[PDB]
Amino acid sequence: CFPGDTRILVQIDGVPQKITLRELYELFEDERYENMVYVRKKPKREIKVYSIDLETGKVVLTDIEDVIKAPATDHLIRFELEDGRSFETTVDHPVLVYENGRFIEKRAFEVKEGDKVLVSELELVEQSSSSQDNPKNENLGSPEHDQLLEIKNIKYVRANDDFVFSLNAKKYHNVIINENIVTHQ
């Protein structure tokens, strides 16, 4: 899991939005109690989730199974990228790094400084602050970026929220967060 602070890239009403899991989560309703955590299922709008295909390395879109809401109990490791991107995980959560010419899944507490993550590097063009715009898919709609980022700094930090999220969708434990940081079990 990641802190609610973790930004998740999704698609809402055919519009890609990058919003924290605590924010993304809100696009959902119907919360159930299970596994000693909370599970929210069924979006109140058209909510899709941007995920990555490990095998091909492409950014795909899928439907959501539910929202992963769990009481912030453990602490989280933070990864700071050379670009200034940073993401956190419950340390037990595997991180997807691109080393040895392959993609490997290592726990946050198993990841080391100077490690990499896969970034889809594919933006939605409109990086405007807040949800001011939405019905815009103009400006061609074709990006271009092929580069992965190394972790400049890792640290042990504490969960910002009292709940942590990951957003459960198809393929499971595979989502694009922060500045498109890809992770998978």
9-to-51, 56, 147 alpha-carbon distances in Å: 8, 19, 18
Token readout for 57 is: 């390395």
**Element (DSSP H or E) covering residue 93:** none
Backbone phi and psi for residue 25, each to the nearest 5 degrees, phi listed first: -45, -35
Cβ contact 185:89 at 8 Å: no
Compute φ and ψ for 115, nearest 5 degrees.
-75, 170
Assign residue 123 the CATH number of its domain: 2.170.16.10
Inter-residue contact 95 to 183 (CB < 8 Å): yes
For the chain, how many helices (H) and strands (E)? Answer: 1, 17
**Structure-token match 């769990």, residue found:** 70
How was it solved? NMR
Among residues 10, 22, 13, the alpha carbon closest in space to that of 175 is found at: 10
8 Å CB contact between 31 and 39: yes
- Estimate to the nearest angstrom the gap between the alpha carbon of 93 and the chain centroid: 12
Considering only the C-alpha atoms of the chain, give the largest distance between any 2 of them, rounded to a whole number of Å: 46
Number of domains in the chain: 1
Domain coverage including residue 70: 1-185
Compute how many other C-beta atoms are within 10 angstroms of the C-beta atom of residue 184.
18
Phi, psi for residue 3 in degrees, rounded to 5:
-65, 160
**49: which strand partners?**
10, 62
For residue 29, what is the enclosing H or E element? none
